[PDB]
């Protein structure tokens, strides 16, 4: 319905400008401070090292930036592997899920080329498995609810409301198992704050996958089973979450 | 069938182990290239500037890292959180692309981002479905003229349906995969392969962030910055439709 389509366009377009205003107002001040700190660091270095021109230091910094950007670590001079078998497994998963954290980048042209086909074939394959698991999990959940639903029907609360309350229990546990449980897990395991962990979980299950936070990626932890196993969580959550994302969609269409 | 999905799980897993082996074999031998480059930069600097100790340069590099980590950029209009870039960043969310080349630093930023997405993604999905339908219509409608030609040529109506799909995607591909990749090559001084990698990583909504095109506007070519936003919208729609139908073919199978 062309009218509706343009209305929707204007709407979203406003949802974005709205987002923009908020993130600017919330993040720009931190950013301008950092830009200031960098310049302070340069100026301090010049005053200490008269054998260095501002312009030369500038190049040093550009070169250092490029290397850190490529995943160099400031702390050391040079063991653990980003591409070790467990981590590579994990990396692939990030593709077919479309999450795409990207905390570790491909460097080889061959890597990029293979990645293209790996995804084109991998994502639809995964989508199908996901639909499958979504149906199967909902079924298991629905059968489970039925037994407690039987108790509500005896208590003479209407079949219409009993169904609604069950939803509340239904998601609340789902959320408990897939949102709340993991966030509590991650806080303790990754040294994140409550809020960081929830941020991570949600960024993950929406498949946004910023990559600022990645469970397991931490170099120090000797926890091999953990990170793929987390992927096991990711499978459940993503399915449970997909069920939800369509539904907030329905509510949105209704208004 | 539950048995069948369990079988499907194993298939995937093998698809993952298979992927793992390839990336490991392809990338492990370059894990440490960036360190090596950093060290080279240090050692070169020391040789040029005898008034600097390794340890002092070390701190410089830590302090620089902290600042870049906060969003600073090397100087020699760069604001990632000015209006235009924040708009773009919000887009990366509702699309679920999530490049992440710019991170949120504030806890408030993270908190707001959660709700922004929960409400934003479904809202965008709906607009996307809408645009997918409207665009598919324009496409299929155009193809209609060629379909008329095939029907005259007494090509079976069933194959005519197939050729139209091939066209349907092939024409999109030209406009949405091939055209942009050629565009970006020239604009971003990326290689042919880098550009395709980018395009596809983007339209699959994987959004690694190693390559990003539309974050800031380009003086001397104004149309660039929006055209990309427009492109992403259409491309995402064209890609979704492929997936739903290839998904569509897949689920019955």
């Amino acid at each position, epitope marked *: 319905r062309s009218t509706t389509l343009l209305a929707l366009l204007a709407l979203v377009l406003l949802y974005l400008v709205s987002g923009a205003l908020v993130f600017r107002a919330l993040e720009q001040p931190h950013e301008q401070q950092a830009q200031r700190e960098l310049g302070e660091v340069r100026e301090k270095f010049l005053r200490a090292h008269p054998c260095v021109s*501002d312009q030369e230091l500038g190049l040093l910094i550009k070169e250092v930036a490029d290397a850190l950007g490529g995943g160099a670590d400031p702390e050391t001079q040079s063991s653990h592997s980003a591409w070790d078998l467990g981590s590579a497994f994990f990396f692939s998963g990030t593709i077919i899920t479309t999450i795409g954290y990207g905390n570790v980048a491909l460097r080889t042209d061959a890597g990029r080329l293979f990645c293209i086909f790996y995804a084109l074939v991998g994502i639809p394959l995964f989508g199908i498995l996901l639909a499958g698991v979504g149906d199967r999990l909902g079924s298991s959940l629905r059968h489970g609810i039925g037994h407690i639903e039987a108790i509500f029907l005896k208590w003479h609360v209407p079949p219409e409301l009993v169904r609604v309350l069950s939803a509340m229990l239904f998601l609340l546990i789902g959320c408990l198992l897939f949102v709340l449980t993991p966030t509590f897990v991650f806080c303790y395991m990754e040294d994140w704050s409550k809020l960081e962990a929830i941020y991570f979980v949600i960024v993950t299950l929406t498949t946004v996958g910023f990559g600022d936070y990645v469970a397991g990626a931490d170099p120090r932890q000797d926890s091999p089973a953990y990170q793929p196993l987390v992927w096991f969580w990711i499978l459940l959550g993503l399915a449970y979450f997909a069920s939800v994302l369509t539904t907030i969609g329905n509510w949105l269409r209704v208004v | 069938r539950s048995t069948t999905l369990l079988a499907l799980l194993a298939l995937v897993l093998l698809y993952l182990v298979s992927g793992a082996l390839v990336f490991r074999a392809l990338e492990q031998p370059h894990e440490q290239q960036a360190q090596r480059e950093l060290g080279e930069v240090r050692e070169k600097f020391l040789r040029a500037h*005898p008034c600097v100790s390794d340890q002092e340069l070390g701190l410089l590099i830590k302090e620089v890292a902290d600042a870049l980590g906060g969003g600073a950029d090397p100087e020699t209009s760069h604001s990632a959180w000015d209006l235009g870039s924040a708009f773009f960043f919000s887009g990366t969310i509702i699309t679920t692309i999530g490049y992440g080349n710019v991170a949120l630093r504030t806890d408030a930023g993270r908190l707001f981002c959660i709700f922004y997405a929960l409400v934003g993604i479904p809202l965008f999905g709906i607009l996307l479905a809408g645009v997918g339908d409207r665009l598919g219509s324009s496409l299929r409608h155009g193809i209609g003229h060629i379909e008329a030609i095939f029907l005259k040529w007494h090509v079976p109506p069933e194959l005519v349906r197939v050729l139209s799909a091939m066209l349907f995607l092939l024409i999109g591909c030209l406009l949405f995969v091939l055209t942009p990749t050629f565009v970006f090559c020239y604009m971003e001084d990326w290689s042919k392969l880098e550009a395709i990698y980018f395009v596809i990583v983007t339209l699959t909504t994987v959004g690694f962030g190693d390559y990003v095109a539309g974050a800031d506007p380009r003086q001397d070519s104004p149309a660039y910055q929006p055209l990309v936003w427009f492109w992403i919208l259409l491309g995402l729609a064209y890609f979704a439709s492929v997936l739903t139908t290839i998904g569509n073919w897949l689920r019955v199978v």
Partner: antibody
Amino acid sequence: EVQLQQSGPELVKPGASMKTSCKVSGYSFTGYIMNWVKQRHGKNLEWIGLINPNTGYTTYNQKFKGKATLTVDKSSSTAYMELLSLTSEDSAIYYCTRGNYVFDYWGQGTTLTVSS
Amino acid sequence: QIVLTQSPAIMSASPGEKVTMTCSASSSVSYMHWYQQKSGTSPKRWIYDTSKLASGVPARFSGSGSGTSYSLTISSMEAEDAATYYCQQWSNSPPTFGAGAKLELKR
């Protein structure tokens, strides 16, 4: 007592080029950045560019990118500036001064006259 | 290409008077430096890093400021203070200069 001693006034024809020098004493030539500055009869000061005597590195004010070449002789701890295809607009006083953030020591200046 | 404005370009002071000359920057700057020039001779570093006094300089001189606004002050004018004063910046390359402020003796 740091000192930058510049060579004497120079007179050249329009179209010619010119080279002028600045010897340093009282400190280590290769330890500090050298700059040149133009002052056209008693008016604003204009930074021409710098050279790092130790590394050979140079950068120039965009205004002077084509016009001026900076070099150094490490052994005699002397800095040089060459100016090219001179016009009457180039007649001015030119200083060498030292520094990477403030210009802490200056030569006494040298006057360039461009004339027929 | 930060631009430094010194206004007014000319001023005069009787001996004993307090003198203040200012430098506004087109965009923020972390430190300002000042040079004294007497006609016939090269500029001398006078004040650097906003408020540090160079070796020779008498204490009647001071400097202050921040961000985009900086100033040089003489608590009590003297005769040998007649000169041109220039501000300069190097928080961004290329370094740049104000166009000078000429300070003559009143009489």
